[PDB]
Write a protein that binds this ligand. Structure first.
Ligand code: B0D
Ligand code: B0D
Ligand code: B0D
Ligand code: B9D
Ligand code: CA
Ligand code: CL
Length: 496
């Protein structure tokens, strides 16, 4: 469960948040495969509640109605087409599995679902699965409200309703089997792994019992014995009885401390400095690298809906964001996930975004297709951070330096640092309020390298900054604090 199952050489996954299956399929062939992306995390593919108040919020997809592959992203045919086309070009698909709960207990009964399936939260009836009152934790939960009230009580966190979401009785074989049926359906279609949503709200043992029922990956694409990649969504920032390490026996875990701390460092909050990143990784109290799924921001916390808090960097903070993502992609710690979002009318009131519920770009509820601009950017309000030169080129940087050790670290005791990856790559950052100009040891072979942040390597030439490495591996770097991107990155595949 710990291996991503990506093609050899591809080291990252991208979250194509709320994208339609047909658009992801095309993206796999026209950009992800050629650019070396390892895979795609897709939004929940199972039928969810259609919420009209507010109008089709993104979070409606985290309120299951059934396991039918029928959503605003598409139907089963479209989903299968996407998984097949992506796998055929060496790009994997990871499913956001919402298996801890069904929809909110107060949601109105009826057919307001993405596939028209009938459901009655009040009577705990979900005939399309089917689930009944016997399949929920109503009688197991000991809180007065029936919802989670205290995170200091590890039991209620798992047996009670997360903000009212009907909590499935994961200890029952029937429920475990229905969930396994859904996940095996996806694995047989070709999915390479899963993000287990709300894993903190599930007992480690229950998750294991479910994972024990899963199939090996489809043998038409994967070698015999391949196990689905499992990364559990556990928000553990410390100070709680439940720890992310409690889930290591099931697969990897999302390390939310990563983006929270990186954000505070790059923002220079509380006096934090980039020079402190020298021992980045386990030294900062993070989970072991081989159990970490890292990211700068996710679909939740990029809109103040998750951990990390206000320190989280997002596309809204483009300049600092690119630097944070660049550092993450260059550093060897963990398995990296890049975020791809959509723009929404952010409206802050008293420090809170009143429009943080807004769903994907749409026309009368129908998700807009992803249009590509002549400059390779996206239209229809899709941000497509993964297409930003500074991010895409760093995704490739990580591939090129895969396996190389963290070395040749340098820092000015403030916010100017640099480091290399063996003899395959080198990166320099200037996050201080003054310019940077110094000759550093890159550990790279002599030659002329193209900076992949300010430009690209095209036909034996660089479109941006050029770096000259001497016979001793030394090279001069100049970065103004006024530069569009205050960091430079060069690697073996950017050499002239
Ligand atoms: O270890 C068993 C388990 F995984 O975790 C706890 F012991 C729960 O009480 C139990 O219902 C669940 O199946
Ligand atoms: O993740 C499951 C677990 F928490 O850790 C290991 F997987 C153990 O083998 C299992 O029995 C235990 O319930
Ligand atoms: O903000 C995160 C969230 F939306 O609410 C709580 F933090 C849950 O523990 C987490 O699993 C869920 O994703
Ligand atoms: C997990 O599923 C939920 F329903 C619970 O948090 C959503 O609200 C979250 O955004 C998703 O990560
Ligand atoms: Ca639960
Ligand atoms: Cl996540």
């Amino acid at each position: 469960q710990y291996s991503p199952n990506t093609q050899q050489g591809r080291t990252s996954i991208v979250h194509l948040f709320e994208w339609r299956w047909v658009d992801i399929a095309l993206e796999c062939e026209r950009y992800l495969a050629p650019k070396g992306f390892g895979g795609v995390q897709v939004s929940p593919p199972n039928e969810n509640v259609a919420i009209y108040n507010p109008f089709r919020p993104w979070w409606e997809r985290y309120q299951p109605v059934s396991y039918k592959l029928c959503t605003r992203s598409g139907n089963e045919d479209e989903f299968r087409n996407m998984v097949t086309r992506c796998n055929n070009v060496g790009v994997r698909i990871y499913v956001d599995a919402v298996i801890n709960h069904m929809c909110g207990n107060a949601v109105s009964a009826g057919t307001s679902s993405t596939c028209g399936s009938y459901f009655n939260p009040g009577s705990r009836d979900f005939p399309a699965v089917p689930y009944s009152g016997w399949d929920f934790n109503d009688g197991k939960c000991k809180t007065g409200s029936g919802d989670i009230e205290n995170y200091n009580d590890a039991t209620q966190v798992r047996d009670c309703r997360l903000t009212g979401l009907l909590d499935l009785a994961l200890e029952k074989d029937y429920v475990r089997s229905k969930i396994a049926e859904y996940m095996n359906h996806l694995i047989d279609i070709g999915v390479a792994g899963f993000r287990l949503d709300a894993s903190k709200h599930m007992w480690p043992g229950d998750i294991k019992a479910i994972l024990d029922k899963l199939h090996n990956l489809n043998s038409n694409w994967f070698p015999a014995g391949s196990k689905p990649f499992i990364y559990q969504e556990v928000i553990d920032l410390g100070g709680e009885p439940i720890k992310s390490s409690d889930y290591f026996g099931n697969g990897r875990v999302t390390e939310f401390k990563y983006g929270a701390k990186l954000g505070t460092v790059i923002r220079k909050w509380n006096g934090e400095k980039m020079s402190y990143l020298k021992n980045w990784g386990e030294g900062w109290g993070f989970v072991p690298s081989d159990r970490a799924l890292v990211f700068v921001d996710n679909h939740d916390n990029q809109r103040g809906h998750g951990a990390g808090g206000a320190s989280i960097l997002t596309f809204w903070d483009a300049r600092l964001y690119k630097m944070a993502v660049g550092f993450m992609l260059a550093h060897p710690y963990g398995f990296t996930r890049v975020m791809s979002s959509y723009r929404w009318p952010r409206q802050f009131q008293n420090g809170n975004d009143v429009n943080d519920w807004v769903g994907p770009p749409n026309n009368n509820g129908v998700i807009k297709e992803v249009t590509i601009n002549p400059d390779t950017t996206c239209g229809n309000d899709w941000v497509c951070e993964h297409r930003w030169r500074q991010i895409r080129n760093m995704v490739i940087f990580r591939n090129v330096v895969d396996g190389q050790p963290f070395t040749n670290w340098y820092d000015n005791g403030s916010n100017q640092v640099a480091f290399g990856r063996g003899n395959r790559g080198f990166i320099v950052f200037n996050n201080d309020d003054w310019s940077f100009s110094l000759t550093l040891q890159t550990g790279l072979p002599a030659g002329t390298y193209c900076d992949v942040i300010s430009g690209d390597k095209i036909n034996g030439n660089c479109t941006g900054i050029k770096i000259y490495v001497s016979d001793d591996g030394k090279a001069h770097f100049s970065i103004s604090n006024s530069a569009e991107d205050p960091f430079i990155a060069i690697h073996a595949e950017s050499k002239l």
